[PDB]
């Protein structure tokens, strides 16, 4: 018998690839996730499988910030506009603190 079939898929190997304080170069994938567990913050972009990658080069910091969705996000705005007064949502965000300056001015000629 045993009429249950399927369920043989392997693990997705998702989750955090870069924790706190890890030095991260530009484009490095920080986290891979099936749902929005960690949200993109400062200098962190999100890819269409909801992956999180660094837009700048620096230090990964996880913070907890208030959640204000876009006014075109219909279901999220519905949850907001049904929330009770005095309450605010909080989400875990991922930031990259840029370590290097954008560039320097240096002498090249003595015209």
């Amino acid at each position: 018998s045993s009429k249950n079939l399927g369920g043989k898929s392997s693990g997705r190997r998702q989750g955090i690839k870069k924790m706190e304080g890890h030095y991260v170069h530009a484009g490095n994938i920080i986290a891979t996730q099936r749902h929005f567990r960690w949200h993109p913050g400062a200098h962190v972009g999100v890819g269409k499988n909801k992956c999180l990658y660094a837009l700048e080069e620096g230090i990964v910091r996880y913070t907890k910030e208030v959640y204000v969705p876009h006014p075109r996000n219909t279901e999220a705005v519905d949850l907001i506009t049904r929330l009770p007064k005095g309450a605010v949502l909080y989400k875990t965000f991922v930031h990259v603190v840029p370590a290097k300056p954008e560039g320097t001015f240096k002498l090249v000629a003595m015209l």
Partner: protein, 50 residues
């Protein structure tokens, strides 16, 4: 449950005593395979509840 209910209902005095359960009805299902079956071949059908 039948042992408890019959014994207490027989021995109690319904004019000056009262009894209640503090245990819910049998809900957890216990399954038994067929008699003489070899190991494997799926999980057995639900037999009773505890």
């Amino acid at each position: 449950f039948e042992m408890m209910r019959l014994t207490i209902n027989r021995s109690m005095d319904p004019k000056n005593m009262f009894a209640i359960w503090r245990v819910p009805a049998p809900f957890k299902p216990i399954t038994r395979k067929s008699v003489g079956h070899r190991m494997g071949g799926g999980k057995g059908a639900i037999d009773h509840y505890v």
